[PDB]
Design an enzyme around this catalytic site. Structure first.
Site, PDB file in Angstrom:
ATOM      1  CG  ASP A 108      -5.386  12.109   4.721  1.00 54.86           C
ATOM      2  OD1 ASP A 108      -4.212  11.832   4.353  1.00 54.86           O
ATOM      3  OD2 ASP A 108      -6.156  11.298   5.312  1.00 54.86           O
ATOM      4  CG  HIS A 120      -2.862   8.479   4.246  1.00 54.31           C
ATOM      5  ND1 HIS A 120      -3.664   9.318   4.980  1.00 54.31           N
ATOM      6  CD2 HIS A 120      -2.765   7.337   4.962  1.00 54.31           C
ATOM      7  CE1 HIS A 120      -4.082   8.695   6.068  1.00 54.31           C
ATOM      8  NE2 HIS A 120      -3.522   7.501   6.095  1.00 54.31           N
ATOM      9  CG  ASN A 179      -3.005   2.199  12.230  1.00 50.95           C
ATOM     10  OD1 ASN A 179      -4.233   2.064  12.298  1.00 50.95           O
ATOM     11  ND2 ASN A 179      -2.402   2.741  11.172  1.00 50.95           N
ATOM     12  CB  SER A 197      -5.847   5.986   7.735  1.00 51.57           C
ATOM     13  OG  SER A 197      -4.993   6.716   8.592  1.00 51.57           O
TER      14      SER A 197
END
Ligand SMILES: [Ca+2]
Ligand SMILES: [Ca+2]
Ligand code: NA
Length: 274
Positions: free
Chosen positions: A32, A63, A154, A220
């Site tokens: 990430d 994130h 998404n 996520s």
């Protein structure tokens, strides 16, 4: 005060933790934007950065820190609580502070995780295409015994169109979609044949830089619930193969409706780990 985000009891992780199984000594790589290692509610054991100019143990986006806290926020009297709070957390920085990364950097992170003996890889990231090298890397990780988990995407739904991203779309990777606190599918959650399971992804509260806690929406946020659940299963059944852990997670999921939209449904780690 420690807040218990709704997703922890929704997947029944609290039931497994109460039995004394918390992911101890299970190595989980979060691929990430980094992790803010200095956050009081996270312990980062190690990692690597494949992003120029940025060290593995910082996070200029937030994130990766958020994803890491869903897996492994420490069980104490502050902050939040991870699915697998005793996990050995590794920060594998493959996305920059703007949230983007190259296929080569992502491949490098997957290879690093495989070579360094990770038990679980979480990839809360995706693209419309993957690459031949990315498929090779995830297939080799899975064959070598790593449970590989990724966000489905998404992109929502559009009639009969398959909107699952890569690497989630690869057969060696568990594609994870998102529900909300009512166990309903979130409208942004991608759909298609490769969707495997659902987990909490709308309204997920977790660790966030600097030294704080924030709510985000996305697949996520769902993926790390499944990565954490894999770690709980391994802490309780340490001899299982990666395919056995994967099949426990999907086979025991709570059916929510059509597999096109939910895969096998919402993970239930109490059932998966029994
Ligand atoms: Ca909550
Ligand atoms: Ca905590
Ligand atoms: Na997949």
């Amino acid at each position: 005060a420690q807040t218990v985000p709704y997703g922890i009891p929704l997947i029944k992780a609290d039931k497994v933790q109460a039995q004394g199984f918390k992911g101890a000594n299970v190595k989980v790589a979060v691929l990430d934007t980094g992790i803010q290692a200095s956050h009081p509610d996270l312990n980062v054991v190690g990692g690597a950065s494949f992003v120029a100019g940025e060290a593995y143990n910082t996070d200029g986006n937030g994130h990766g820190t958020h994803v890491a806290g869903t897996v492994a926020a420490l069980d104490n009297t502050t902050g939040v609580l991870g699915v697998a709070p005793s996990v050995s957390l590794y920060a594998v920085k493959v996305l920059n502070s703007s949230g983007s990364g190259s296929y080569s950097g992502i491949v490098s992170g997957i290879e690093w995780a495989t070579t360094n003996g990770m038990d679980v890889i979480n990839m809360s990231l995706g693209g419309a295409s993957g690459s031949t090298a990315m498929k090779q890397a995830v297939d080799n990780a899975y064959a070598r015994g790593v449970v590989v988990v990724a966000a489905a995407g998404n992109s929502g739904s559009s009639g009969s169109t398959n909107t699952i991203g890569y690497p989630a779309k690869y057969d060696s990777v568990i594609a994870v979609g998102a529900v909300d606190s009512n166990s309903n599918r979130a409208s942004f959650s991608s759909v298609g044949a490769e969707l495997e399971v659902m987990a909490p992804g709308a309204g997920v509260y977790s660790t966030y830089p600097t030294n704080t806690y924030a709510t985000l929406n996305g697949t996520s946020m769902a993926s790390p619930h499944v990565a954490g659940a894999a770690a709980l299963i391994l802490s309780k059944h340490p001899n299982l193969s990666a395919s056995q852990v994967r099949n426990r997670l999907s086979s025991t999921a709570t059916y929510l409706g059509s597999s096109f939209y939910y895969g096998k449904g919402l993970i239930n780690v109490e059932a998966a780990a029994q």
